[PDB]
Amino acid sequence: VGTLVASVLPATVFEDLAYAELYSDPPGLTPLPEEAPLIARSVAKRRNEFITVRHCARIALDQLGVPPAPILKGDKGEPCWPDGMVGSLTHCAGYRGAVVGRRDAVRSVGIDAEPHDVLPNGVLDAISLPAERADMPRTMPAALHWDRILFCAKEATYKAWFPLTKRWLGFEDAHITFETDSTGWTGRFVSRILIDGSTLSGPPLTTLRGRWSVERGLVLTAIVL
Ligand SMILES: [Mn+2]
Ligand SMILES: [Mn+2]
């Protein structure tokens, strides 16, 4: 029933792209024959969010016609999708998200969710450039926790950047600029890469366009290339 993530997706590409979300942990969800060890000795919170988003993903992978299968993690934590597919996962207090795409229509996917709340104390100066840390204030309404939106867009960038280059991207390795739609709750962002955009295959990564949205007290960001 959940469609919030769609508020930051390209509708014109919904043929090859599917999404599924949940706002909590439904009882009786289980891991999978090969996922159980990845979660074997983690505390309950980590357990449930891991199970729930992987249920969301398989729903979305089904809706694209792909039999269910384990989504293991690779070194550096990236989810492992069945061949031909790509996508992104996110979880936080109140939200579980999965977006999946078919390769030759979607280069890769990056999504992130945060509670639409101020950042904790020392955090906004470690993920923001001084440029961003001064300009963003002049692009969004006061009711917007823009430092949190910035944080959120940073990680969507990283999540879409990584499967393409398998290289680290720091919070200072991309500069992001925001604009807002007339609503004051949704808008656009652009991520300029401050380092070699060399990809594992194909043209470099320079600028990532994406969408953000404040919706139901969550922050949502998505990059789909
Ligand atoms: Mn999480
Ligand atoms: Mn996040």
Side-chain angles (χ1 to χ4, degrees), residues 1-137 139-225:
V1 301
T3 30
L4 314 159
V5 64
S7 168
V8 294
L9 289 183
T12 52
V13 187
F14 270 159
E15 173 67 289
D16 306 294
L17 180 85
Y19 56 79
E21 66 190 31
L22 284 166
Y23 312 124
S24 73
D25 296 299
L29 292 179
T30 182
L32 226 57
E34 308 168 41
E35 310 181 336
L38 297 208
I39 183 206
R41 175 148 297 283
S42 331
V43 95
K45 205 204 112 282
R46 170 61 177 148
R47 269 211 140 246
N48 294 317
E49 93 200 341
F50 171 100
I51 286 150
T52 311
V53 299
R54 277 173 165 68
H55 181 63
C56 291
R58 282 184 276 272
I59 289 167
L61 281 175
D62 187 349
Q63 288 188 336
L64 285 197
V66 169
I71 303 315
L72 328 162
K73 311 235 298 192
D75 9 308
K76 287 311 293 259
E78 70 285 28
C80 304
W81 310 102
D83 66 327
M85 302 313 285
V86 60
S88 192
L89 309 176
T90 175
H91 28 61
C92 66
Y95 186 98
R96 287 80 172 96
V99 166
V100 174
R102 303 184 185 94
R103 285 185 120 266
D104 214 319
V106 184
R107 284 197 82 187
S108 83
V109 187
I111 72 190
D112 190 85
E114 299 287 323
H116 178 240
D117 250 302
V118 58
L119 282 186
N121 270 332
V123 171
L124 171 279
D125 15 358
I127 61 64
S128 102
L129 290 160
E132 297 160 351
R133 205 187 305 108
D135 149 283
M136 253 205 70
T139 47
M140 313 184 69
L144 287 182
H145 295 129
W146 63 277
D147 59 335
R148 179 78 68 150
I149 289 150
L150 178 44
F151 178 57
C152 187
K154 289 283 189 174
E155 294 154 310
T157 294
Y158 176 84
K159 281 193 221 158
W161 152 275
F162 190 94
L164 286 200
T165 69
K166 312 289 268 292
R167 288 179 294 123
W168 159 253
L169 180 93
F171 294 108
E172 71 292 13
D173 296 48
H175 172 100
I176 308 181
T177 6
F178 295 82
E179 54 198 35
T180 313
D181 311 324
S182 182
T183 53
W185 293 106
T186 188
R188 295 280 150 106
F189 75 91
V190 187
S191 288
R192 323 266 168 186
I193 303 300
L194 301 183
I195 62 157
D196 175 22
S198 162
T199 58
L200 253 62
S201 47
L205 255 330
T206 300
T207 39
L208 314 182
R209 294 187 148 75
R211 291 124 156 158
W212 65 275
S213 190
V214 173
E215 200 129 11
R216 296 305 211 139
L218 296 170
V219 175
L220 286 130
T221 63
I223 298 312
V224 34
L225 306 167

PDB file of all heavy atoms in Angstrom, residues 49 90-92, ligand 1:
ATOM      1  N   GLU A  49      14.854  -5.165  10.675  1.00  0.00           N
ATOM      2  CA  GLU A  49      14.964  -4.279   9.523  1.00  0.00           C
ATOM      3  C   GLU A  49      15.605  -5.015   8.356  1.00  0.00           C
ATOM      4  O   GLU A  49      15.224  -4.813   7.190  1.00  0.00           O
ATOM      5  CB  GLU A  49      15.754  -3.024   9.888  1.00  0.00           C
ATOM      6  CG  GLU A  49      17.258  -3.136   9.598  1.00  0.00           C
ATOM      7  CD  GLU A  49      18.095  -2.129  10.371  1.00  0.00           C
ATOM      8  OE1 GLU A  49      17.526  -1.122  10.840  1.00  0.00           O
ATOM      9  OE2 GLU A  49      19.312  -2.356  10.514  1.00  0.00           O
ATOM     10  N   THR A  90      16.945   0.508   1.909  1.00  0.00           N
ATOM     11  CA  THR A  90      17.099   1.436   3.025  1.00  0.00           C
ATOM     12  C   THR A  90      16.167   1.064   4.184  1.00  0.00           C
ATOM     13  O   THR A  90      15.054   0.572   3.975  1.00  0.00           O
ATOM     14  CB  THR A  90      16.865   2.878   2.548  1.00  0.00           C
ATOM     15  OG1 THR A  90      16.898   3.773   3.657  1.00  0.00           O
ATOM     16  CG2 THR A  90      15.541   3.003   1.851  1.00  0.00           C
ATOM     17  N   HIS A  91      16.635   1.304   5.416  1.00  0.00           N
ATOM     18  CA  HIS A  91      15.814   1.163   6.617  1.00  0.00           C
ATOM     19  C   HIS A  91      16.198   2.231   7.638  1.00  0.00           C
ATOM     20  O   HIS A  91      17.363   2.592   7.786  1.00  0.00           O
ATOM     21  CB  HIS A  91      15.922  -0.257   7.297  1.00  0.00           C
ATOM     22  CG  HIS A  91      17.219  -0.944   7.056  1.00  0.00           C
ATOM     23  ND1 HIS A  91      18.428  -0.418   7.470  1.00  0.00           N
ATOM     24  CD2 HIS A  91      17.516  -2.081   6.388  1.00  0.00           C
ATOM     25  CE1 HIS A  91      19.409  -1.210   7.083  1.00  0.00           C
ATOM     26  NE2 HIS A  91      18.886  -2.227   6.425  1.00  0.00           N
ATOM     27  N   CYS A  92      15.197   2.680   8.378  1.00  0.00           N
ATOM     28  CA  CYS A  92      15.331   3.550   9.532  1.00  0.00           C
ATOM     29  C   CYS A  92      14.066   3.379  10.358  1.00  0.00           C
ATOM     30  O   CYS A  92      13.082   2.778   9.910  1.00  0.00           O
ATOM     31  CB  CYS A  92      15.508   5.019   9.132  1.00  0.00           C
ATOM     32  SG  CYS A  92      14.062   5.772   8.318  1.00  0.00           S
TER      33      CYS A  92
HETATM   34 MN    MN B   1      19.318   1.551   8.348  1.00  0.00          MN
END
